[PDB]
Every structure is written in structure tokens, then in C-alpha cells.
Amino acid sequence: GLDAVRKRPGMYIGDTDDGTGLHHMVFEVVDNAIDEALAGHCDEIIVTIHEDESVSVSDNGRGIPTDIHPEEGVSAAEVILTILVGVSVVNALSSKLHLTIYRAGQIHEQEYHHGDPQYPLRVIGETDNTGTTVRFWPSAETFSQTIFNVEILARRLRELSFLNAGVRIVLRDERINLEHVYDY
Ligand SMILES: Cc1[nH]c(C(=O)Nc2nc3c(O[C@@H](C)c4ccccc4)cc(C(=O)O)cc3s2)c(Cl)c1Cl
Ligand SMILES: [Ca+2]
Fold this sequence. Notes:
Blueprint: H1 2-7, H2 10-13, H3 20-38, E1 44-49, E2 55-59, E3 68-69, E4 74-75, H4 76-82, H5 87-92, E5 94-103, E6 106-113, E7 116-117, E8 122-126, E9 131-138, H6 150-163, E10 168-173, E11 178-182
Parallel strand pairs: 1-10
Antiparallel strand pairs: 1-2, 2-9, 3-4, 5-6, 5-9, 6-7, 6-8, 10-11
Helix pairs in contact: 3-6
Residues 175-176 line the site of calcium ion.
């Protein structure tokens, strides 16, 4: 039910003007990667602010399940990204979101626009790795400001590194060629 989110985003992501809601978009995706670390599946998270102002979060966890969900008739990954904070809220309020999954020897991908899948999750190659990459462009129709602040992200990643000592958290800002490694 992502229509309701796109109609009243403040109720799901918080303040869409003061920068708190915008950065909550990144935090929600990072929190999913952190949950993979808490369960003992993930020990590296890479958070990138791209030149195009998009943000990528890569983990080396199990990868979001790709098998069809019987109740929905689509990949589990699509059900997680499209049905109702939940990464589906990030998807709903993103002009574009690109999902890559490394799982069971295969690379899977899906792209969305305002949370609508452009095509069903598809196999695009082979991999010896496991994990999830989410890259998203926050919607300017939802957020009055869309530029991520490296200092706001860094402070939260420092906290998460402290609270999750076994996880190597890499922060990259391509706009200023910054890389910081947080690892307790
Ligand atoms: C950056 C990033 N990483 C992840 C990420 O790794 N999530 C994973 N979730 C699972 C998992 O729960 C699924 C079925 C589930 C997720 C949400 C709500 C209800 C259900 C099950 C399994 C499994 O059984 O193997 C694996 C994973 S990995 C997300 Cl989401 C984002 Cl965003
Ligand atoms: Ca620059």
C-alpha cells in the first residue's frame, strides 16, 4: 500500500523539509544492513554519496530472498520493496531505486520509479558473493531539499560502528573524494 506513503510521506519518513526525513531514507536502508550484521551474516557495509547526489548502501549479508512469494506471485525482494518504517517507504519516496542481490551463486537486479517496478527481478550474472546493494534517488516532489550531508551520515555511521563492533562501515562522498572507515 505505497499510495498512502506517496500521498502523506511525513507520516512514514518524518519531516520532508528540515533534512531529518531525507537522512532517515539512508538510515532506514543502513538499518536493514545492520540487522544482517546483528544476525551474524554481514561484517562490511559501504555507504556512498554519488556525484549525482544518489546514495548506495552495500552489505555482504545473505542477500534479500529472490524466490517467488506464493501469496504475491512476484520475487520476495519485490514484495519487501513494494508492500508496506520498511525499505518499501524509501522505495515509495525515491524517483528511482536500483536493487542488486548477490545470492545462491547469482546476481539479481530490479529497478523502480516512485516504487513501481520497471521489470520483474532478473538474473544478470554469476557471483561467489552474497549481499544486497540499494541505490536510491530521493524524490524532489516529496523532499524540498534532496542533498545528503556527509557530516549527518558520518555521525550516525560512527554510532552504528560503536554499537556493532564486528562491522566495518565505509563512508564514501564522491562529491569531495572523501572515504572514512568506521571499525570498532
Ligand atoms: C541493504 C539491505 N539489506 C537487506 C537485507 O539483507 N535484508 C534481508 N532480509 C532477509 C530475510 O528476511 C526477509 C524475508 C524480510 C525482510 C524484511 C521484512 C520481512 C522479511 C530473509 C533472508 C533469508 O531467509 O535468507 C535473508 C535476508 S537479507 C535489506 Cl532489506 C536492505 Cl534494504
Ligand atoms: Ca565536487
